[PDB]
Structures are given as structure tokens and as C-alpha cells.
Design a protein around this ligand. Structure first.
Ligand SMILES: CC(=O)N[C@H]1[C@H]([C@H](O)[C@H](O)CO)OC(C(=O)O)=C[C@@H]1NC(=N)N
Length: 356
């Protein structure tokens, strides 16, 4: 394990069970928003204020994102998104009928999953009513899908003309059900939602990052022994290029979700950071990977050990300049056989004292 600034558990599986973390930074108020699935069942949230003096994050009391649900459906895969332009907070998620499951939908081929979002204009303190965007965003294609999902994890807003909203997703499309990664795009600040195109075969949960002319790189889990990296030159509408990244291992089963963010290069305008279990055959040993010449896959560094032991899902968030003057990061990840979601806060200089 690497020397960090903070390591506290934001969610602990005691009187309840938590999974599928989601982190979101608010640069204006230097606050983090920690989302997670509670039991699926509901989506909880926990705001934690970053205190500069102690180089700490004081986490407030958690709460149930109540409106983030649909009667008779259970909520899953929280995907927070902050529109800097309008200062609107978006929380996407997936709603599934009562006890129905993924395998039930995959085997039955009867998609019943629902794409939703709630928004907050006072920083997730209170939320708008749920807006079911299924039909409008997916359209006819919905009948060709056995099921689909968003995130989990932070979404992405672009620096293009419209400051477009990008939401990573994947779906089991028919051709027998094959999963593919794609993005839901909004060029009107969430007003309306189009649906981008798919990547090469077999790609599940994924996250997107931007980098500078302007390409959106996607990192998705696969059933292969590695991660798949797709690049879009038309803002996520199409991901023309797609490669398997050998250095980015994926545990045996069907892989494990991962997280990728972009941040200000110390010297391309950005660099990429990526967290994922590094262990060879099991979900353990969460590692951090650095790409100093993005999107070049062969530019991916070796992982740096973040946490030894059982580590599954994760979500990263850039948090501006850290104490040592280098980039500061916030990492939300599942640990100890899903008995808790641990928060980690460290700097570039702390994780990669060489490439700095
Ligand atoms: C919606 C849903 O069923 N999400 C699954 C996810 C999913 O099965 C894979 O990405 C591909 O099907 O896998 C895993 C997983 O641990 O591999 C947990 C997620 N669980 C929850 N979000 N509750």
C-alpha cells in the first residue's frame, strides 16, 4: 500500500450493505459527493467537505437519494455529473422491475431496464423528481437490447462548443446477447438525450475521459484478459479506434469495473489516471495506473499499489492542486469482500514520485 493523505471508510456494511461507488468533485465548494447502492435497492449519498489545514475530508452524514427511484423498481449504478455551465447536478441510474434480474433479462431477452436521472441545483442537498428517459434516449433500439446500464461512476462533460454531457453506458445487443460500450449524449445541458454508437464487440461497464485535437478515450471492462480502450474523434458519437490494452489486466470471471479520469498535465494537455484491481485472478490489490502520453495505450504505466487485499469497483475524481503542489486525487473503492467502500486521497507526487 502507498502513503496517502487520507483513508477512511465513507460507507461500511454494518446495519446495511453497500456497493457500486460513485465520486464527484465540486471545485467551487471543494466538496466531494459519494454515491453508492444500498441494500440492489436504493442509492445513498454522502457529502464530505475537504479541509485544507488538516489535508482532510470531513464526511457529513449519509442520506437516501429518495427521488432517485421509480415505484416498484430498484435503483442501481449511480452516475453523477456536474454541469459547470449551468451548475446543475445530474444523477443518472438504472431502474429494474421488482425482483427481476440481469440474467433474467439476458436469458429472457425481454429488456425492462430503465434509464433515469434526477437533478439538484443546490448541490445534491435536495433532488428533482425522477425523469425516465428510456424511450426518448434509446428509441426503437430498445427492443434489440436484452438490457443495458450506465456507468457506474462519474460521467463526463466536454469542452466543445456546447459543453456537451457524455454518459458512459453499455448494452447487450442482439445479432445471442452481446454487450457493447457506448455513450448517451446531450448537447443542450441534459435538455434532450441522443444515443451514440457502439464500440467493437464485448465491452461492459466503462468510463470516459477527455484529452487534448480533442479526443474522448473510453476504458471498458471485457471478458478478455484485459481492458478495452476506445477513442472518439467526433465527441463520443463514434469511437472509431479500439484496442485491447494488455498492461491493463482484467480478473478471470467477466472482469471488474474500473475508473479513469483526466487531469492537468505537469508539462498533451492532460494525463490519465486509472484505478482497477491488479491481482491476476481475483478482485484484489487495487492499483493506480498513469498515462503521460494519452491516449497511447503503450504509454500506460505499471500499476502502483493503492490497497492490498480485496478490492473491487472504484471511481476516481481529480481534486485540483494538492499540498505538495502536485495533482490531488480522490478515490472511492469497494474493499473487504464488499463489506465497505473506502475513500482514498493522495497526490501525483505521492503515487508516482518518478513520472512527476
Ligand atoms: C446492473 C448490474 O447487474 N450490475 C452488476 C455488474 C454487471 O453484471 C456487469 O457489468 C455485466 O453484466 O457486475 C457486477 C460485478 O460485481 O461484476 C456488480 C453490478 N451490480 C450492481 N450494480 N448492483
Amino acid at each position: 500500500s502507498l502513503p496517502v493523505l487520507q483513508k477512511e471508510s465513507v460507507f461500511q456494511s454494518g446495519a446495511h450493505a453497500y456497493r457500486i461507488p460513485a465520486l464527484l468533485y465540486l471545485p467551487g465548494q471543494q466538496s466531494l459527493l459519494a454515491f453508492a447502492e444500498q441494500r440492489a435497492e436504493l442509492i445513498v449519498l454522502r457529502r464530505g467537505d475537504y479541509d485544507a489545514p488538516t489535508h482532510q475530508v470531513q464526511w457529513q452524514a449519509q442520506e437516501v437519494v429518495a427521488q432517485a427511484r421509480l415505484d416498484g423498481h430498484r435503483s442501481m449504478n449511480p452516475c453523477p455529473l456536474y454541469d459547470a455551465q449551468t451548475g446543475t447536478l445530474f444523477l443518472f441510474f438504472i431502474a429494474i422491475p421488482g425482483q427481476v434480474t440481469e440474467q433474467q433479462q439476458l436469458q429472457t431477452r425481454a429488456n425492462v431496464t430503465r434509464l433515469c436521472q434526477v437533478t439538484s441545483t443546490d448541490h445534491g442537498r435536495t433532488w428533482s423528481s425522477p425523469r425516465d428517459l428510456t424511450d426518448a434516449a434509446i428509441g426503437p433500439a430498445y427492443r434489440e437490447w436484452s438490457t443495458f446500464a450506465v456507468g457506474p461512476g462519474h460521467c463526463l462533460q466536454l469542452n466543445d462548443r456546447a459543453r456537451s454531457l457524455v454518459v458512459p453506458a453499455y448494452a447487450y445487443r442482439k445479432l445471442r446477447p452481446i454487450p457493447s460500450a457506448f455513450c448517451f449524449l446531450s448537447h443542450d445541458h441534459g435538455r434532450t438525450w441522443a444515443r451514440g454508437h457502439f464500440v467493437a464487440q464485448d465491452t461492459l461497464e466503462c468510463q470516459v475521459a477527455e484529452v487534448e485535437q480533442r479526443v474522448v478515450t473510453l476504458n471498458a471492462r471485457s471478458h478478455l484478459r484485459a481492458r478495452v480502450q476506445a477513442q472518439s474523434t467526433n465527441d463520443g458519437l463514434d469511437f472509431q479506434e479500439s484496442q485491447l490494452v494488455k498492461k491493463l489486466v482484467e480478473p478471470p470471471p467477466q472482469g471488474c469495473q474500473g475508473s479513469v479520469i483526466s487531469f492537468p498535465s505537469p508539462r498533451p494537455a492532460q494525463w490519465l489516471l486509472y484505478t482497477h484491481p491488479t491481482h491476476s485472478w481475483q478482485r484484489a490489490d487495487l492499483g493506480a495506473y498513469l498515462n503521460p502520453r494519452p491516449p497511447a495505450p503503450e504509454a500506460w504505466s505499471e500499476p502502483v499499489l493503492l490497497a492490498k487485499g480485496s478490492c473491487a469497483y472504484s471511481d476516481l475524481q481529480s481534486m485540483g492542486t494538492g499540498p505538495d503542489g502536485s495533482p490531488l486525487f480522490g478515490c472511492l473503492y469497494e474493499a473487504n469482500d464488499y463489506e465497505e467502500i473506502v475513500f482514498l486521497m493522495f497526490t501525483l507526487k505521492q503515487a508516482f514520485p518518478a513520472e512527476y
